């Protein structure tokens, strides 16, 4: 009579924690969703093979509208696991699912996994210096989202870094590239003219964190906007005021122009 929320990590099936694997291996039923993020280095088959169980993949609709009809029923009489990319409760609405489990008289436990939220550390930017986070969403029809632009503005004024999750439309197999995010932001700048995101703005790109050779790049928008960062997923970061050691790392590791070594203070 237990439900396990288990994260699978950043890139492939091996990013799951040992705790998560051992517990998953012993669950009666295993469910999972792969719409909240992209695990570019694995396949359902490899995950199933590793866990030694069949995995019933659920759609966003299955989860958001039918979690209590598809998963909870079995958790009332068995040990059930629900797998997700990265950490199960990060930048998702999955936390609320625990309230649903509770209301159904089902106990739930959470097994964390590496998340893009902490993986940003590989960019050299001090993680405590990150401010509010946001998501660059694809415009649809006449609706053109722009709130994420205001988040960068608010953080930048405080000298804080901004983590930008990029949009994803799993059913259409669409994964926003850092390039597309930069294009959208330049358009918002043209509209708002707040001097928040321009061709000279320094940005950082982290692609396929979790893999052994992720792409880590830093530089002016004008120079990176047309660069190929490899396959998704990508995240975009707009740093705030940099510490000298952050700049050094960006230059030495992310190939940023030596020019940024000269921090204004």
Ligand X SMILES: Nc1ncnc2c1ncn2[C@@H]1O[C@H](CSCC[C@H](N)C(=O)O)[C@@H](O)[C@H]1O
Residues binding a copy of itself (CB under 8 A): 7, 9-10, 12-19, 21-22, 50, 86-96, 98-99, 102-103, 109-115, 117-119, 121-122, 124, 126-135, 154, 158, 160, 165, 209-210, 212-213, 245-246, 248-249, 252-253
Task: Map residues 63-102 to x or -, x wherever contact with ligand X holds by CB under 6 A.
Answer: ----------------------xxx--xxx----------
Q: Give CA–CA dist 135/118, Å, rounded.
A: 16
Stretch that binds ligand X, among 48-56, 66-74, 116-124, 140-148 (CB under 6 A): 116-124
Q: Give CA–CA dist 170/172, Å, rounded.
A: 5
Q: Would you count residue 120 as binding ligand X (CB under 6 A)?
A: no
For residue 208, give both structure tokens. Answer: 């396929």
- Cis ω for the linkage preceding 233 (within 30 of 0): yes
CB of 239 to a copy of itself, least distance (A): 13
Q: Give CA–CA dist 133/151, Å, rounded.
A: 7
For residue 24, give both structure tokens. Answer: 């998953």
Separation in Å, CA 13 to CA 33, 112, 119, 170, 216:
14, 14, 17, 19, 22
Cβ nearer to a copy of itself, comparing 92 with 201 = 92
Residue 38 DSSP class = -
* List of residues contacting ligand X (CB under 6 A): 10-11, 36-37, 85-87, 90-92, 115-118, 165-166, 168, 206-210, 233-235
């Amino acid at each position: 009579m237990v439900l396990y929320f288990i994260g699978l990590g950043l890139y492939d099936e091996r990013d799951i924690t040992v705790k998560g694997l051992e517990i998953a291996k012993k669950c009666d039923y295993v469910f999972a969703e792969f719409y909240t993020s992209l695990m570019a280095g694995t396949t359902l088959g490899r995950i199933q093979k590793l866990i030694g169980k069949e995995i019933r993949v659920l759609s966003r609709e299955d989860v958001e509208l039918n979690f209590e009809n598809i998963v909870l029923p079995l958790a009332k009489e068995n040990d059930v696991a629900f797998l997700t990319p990265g950490d199960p409760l990060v930048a998702t609405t999955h936390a609320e699912l625990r309230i649903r489990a509770k209301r159904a008289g089902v106990e739930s436990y959470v097994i964390h996994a590496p998340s893009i939220y902490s993986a940003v550390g590989i960019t050299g930017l001090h993680i405590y210096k990150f401010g509010k986070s946001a998501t660059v969403a694809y415009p649809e029809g006449n609706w053109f989202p722009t709130s994420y632009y205001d988040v960068i503005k608010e953080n930048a004024e405080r000298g804080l870094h901004t983590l930008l999750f990029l949009d994803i439309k799993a059913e259409k197999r669409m994964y926003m590239t850092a390039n597309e995010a930069m294009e959208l932001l330049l358009k918002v700048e043209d509209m708002k003219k707040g001097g928040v995101f321009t061709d000279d703005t320094l940005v950082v790109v982290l692609a396929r964190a979790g893999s052994l050779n992720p792409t880590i790049r830093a530089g002016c928008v004008k120079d990176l906007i047309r660069e190929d960062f490899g396959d998704p997923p990508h995240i975009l970061i707009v740093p705030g005021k940099l510490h000298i050691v952050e700049a050094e790392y960006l230059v030495e590791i992310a190939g940023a122009p030596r020019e940024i070594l000269r921090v204004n203070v």
